[PDB]
């Protein structure tokens, strides 16, 4: 089964719509036919949303519609509101294979937004402990697409730092990214500039947020 | 109200078994169909198996069919999957829903109970704070946060100030660093007038290796 699309990103008041399309003829107006939609928003569990190709369960809004044909069923959206945001799944319960849609992640397109960087030198506990931890913190941001980049002592680190995303806001469709630079208390204590430049599309310049080791 | 509780989840090395159970509530369990659905690391979801009301019928996809059995106790309202033959593809969240008379199949879903298969050991994370500087202040605002780094399983729930700081909050999904071992931080934004007077504390609970810590984050 194919669902498509596998990302929409759509602004608010807009229409949407999401599709499901099987290899076999699911769909049997008049008889009895068992596709289904489900949403789940960041960190919670999936939630029902049409039953029966275009039965709404309780409490879900009428913006949202269901239809079908044949080999395809879809999700219908009318007017996107902030709080849609979240992966949409279908359910093929009708005919053996039971299967589920891969997924299509909704995104809210809004006006870009540059972030505010922090960065965060290690502790002496970590220090204590053997290895140093720096986290330079992108807050608030949109689009998604940022980069960031560790300089050591003018030098750009490579293979020593990882990055980990938000999902996007609903307060205010915005993303916060992290990215940590990791090394051994040897080798921090080996350098004494510790810069983090992020390149974000709402900043016209890159963004470098430095500390040095210790006596500052 | 409708409840389902899953539990039972845990870390199994490959070749072992589980039993992951769901209690109900709300409703009369032994008119229903149950079921338990997975969701896979990659957030793939897949019905894993049903039983009837009665526990008479039963059925699975061939991916589990005949390493996993599902059953259920009319009597305690709970539902069970014991789950054997344990491969690391089985590793993902699992949950117990039940049926809509009107037809639908999952209509009511639980919290999800996390199963990782894996060689690997438990071991509970250490809890460093990210201490709000100058270089972690913008205007009237400051950041801090904590870095709950190398633990193993998943999951880690960090929360502030026991629940009551809730508002400009970042708990960060974990990566997996080379180590084989999760690593996650947690950021709250706060006015920076407010440190040296507030107090800040990041409460780090990891039920697997039973690990409870609060940190007091401090500039």
């Known amino acids: 089964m194919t669902q498509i699309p596998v990302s929409l990103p759509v602004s608010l008041g807009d229409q949407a719509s999401i599709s499901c399309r099987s290899s076999?003829?699911?769909?049997?107006?008049?008889?009895?036919?068992?596709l289904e939609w489900y949403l789940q928003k960041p960190g919670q569990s999936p939630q029902l949303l049409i039953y029966?190709?275009?039965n709404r369960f309780s409490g879900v809004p009428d913006r949202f519609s269901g239809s079908g044909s044949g080999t395809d069923f879809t999700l219908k959206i009318s007017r996107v509101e902030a709080e849609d945001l979240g992966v949409y799944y279908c359910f093929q319960g009708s005919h053996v294979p039971f299967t589920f849609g891969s997924g299509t992640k909704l995104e809210i397109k809004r006006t870009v937004a540059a972030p505010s960087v922090f960065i965060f030198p290690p502790s002496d506990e970590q220090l204590k402990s053997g290895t140093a931890s720096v986290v330079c913190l992108l807050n608030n941001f949109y689009p998604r697409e940022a980069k960031v980049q560790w300089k050591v002592d003018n030098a750009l680190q490579s293979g020593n730092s990882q990055e980990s995303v938000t999902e996007q806001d609903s307060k205010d469709s915005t993303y916060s990214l992290s990215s940590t630079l990791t090394l051994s208390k040897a080798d921090y204590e080996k350098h004494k500039v510790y810069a983090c430049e992020v390149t974000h599309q709402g900043l016209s310049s890159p963004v470098t947020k430095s500390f040095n080791r210790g006596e500052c | 109200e409708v409840n389902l509780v899953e539990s039972g989840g845990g870390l199994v090395q490959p070749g072992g078994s589980l039993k992951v159970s769901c209690v109900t509530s709300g409703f009369t369990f032994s008119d229903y169909y149950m079921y338990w659905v997975r969701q896979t690391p990659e957030k793939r979801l897949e019905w894993v198996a049903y039983?009837?009301?009665?526990?008479?019928?039963?059925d699975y996809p061939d991916t589990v069919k005949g390493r996993f059995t599902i059953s259920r106790d009319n009597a305690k309202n709970s539902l069970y999957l014991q789950m054997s033959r344990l491969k690391s593809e089985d590793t993902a969240m699992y949950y117990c829903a039940r049926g809509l008379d009107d037809g639908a199949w999952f209509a009511y879903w639980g919290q999800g109970t996390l199963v990782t298969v894996s060689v690997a050991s438990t071991k509970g994370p250490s809890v460093f704070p990210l201490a709000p500087s100058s270089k972690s202040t913008s205007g009237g605002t400051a950041a801090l946060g904590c870095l709950v780094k190398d633990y193993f399983p998943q999951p880690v729930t960090v929360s502030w100030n026991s629940g009551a700081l809730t508002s400009g909050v970042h708990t960060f999904p974990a990566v997996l660093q080379s180590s084989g071992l999760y690593s996650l931080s947690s950021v709250v934004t706060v006015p920076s007038s407010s440190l040296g007077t507030q107090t800040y504390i990041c409460n780090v609970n990891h039920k697997p290796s039973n690990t409870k810590v609060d940190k007091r984050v401090e500039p």
């Open positions: 076999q003829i699911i769909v049997h107006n008049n008889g009895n036919t068992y």
């Open positions: 039983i009837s009301q009665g526990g008479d019928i039963t």
């Open positions: 029966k190709v275009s």
